[PDB]
Amino acid sequence: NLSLNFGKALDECKKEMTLTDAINEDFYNFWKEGYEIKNRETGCAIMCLSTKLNMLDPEGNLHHGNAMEFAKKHGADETMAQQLIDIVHGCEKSTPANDDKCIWTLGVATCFKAEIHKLNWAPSMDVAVGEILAEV
């Protein structure tokens, strides 16, 4: 469980987007089964971690719009990775518009989590999170 490291990145995000401590546990639990988190700062956390990919991948394969090698190393080939990517894009289209980008992003991640659940293969949280963070 949890091959990507978000610890330091989350810390930096809390100071840069002036976020309370609630995000140190909320970012993680956001992804657990049957958990619906409706807090904006979880949105902000996601948006801000998609800006620090270079700190999350211990092997340095996680980059924006360019994550196939990371995917591969986390149980998913290219067609599998690509389907996660298409769900992020379809989610970025279907989520209602919003000037608060933290809120919109929480929307997208919310929509993403529900769609990837419908996949007959079961993505690790690492490759699921990695892929949305890489397309956001």
Distance from C-alpha of 69 to C-alpha of 120, rounded to nearest angstrom = 22
Structure determination method = X-ray
Distance from C-alpha of 122 to C-alpha of 115, rounded to nearest angstrom = 11
Distance from C-alpha of 131 to C-alpha of 127, rounded to nearest angstrom = 6
Q: Which residues pair with 66 in a beta bridge?
A: 63
Which has the closest alpha carbon to 83: 55, 54, 112? 112
* CB-based contacts of 76-79 (< 8 A; 24+ apart in sequence): 76/121, 76/123, 76/127
| Contact yes or no for 50/109 (Cβ under 8 A) | no
Q: Is 60 left (phi over 0), alpha (psi -120 to 50) or beta?
A: left
Q: What is the resolution of this structure in A?
A: 2.3
Structure tokens at 77: 């080939």
Q: Superfamily for 1-136?
A: Pheromone/general odorant binding protein domain (1.10.238.20)
Structure tokens at 96: 């209602």
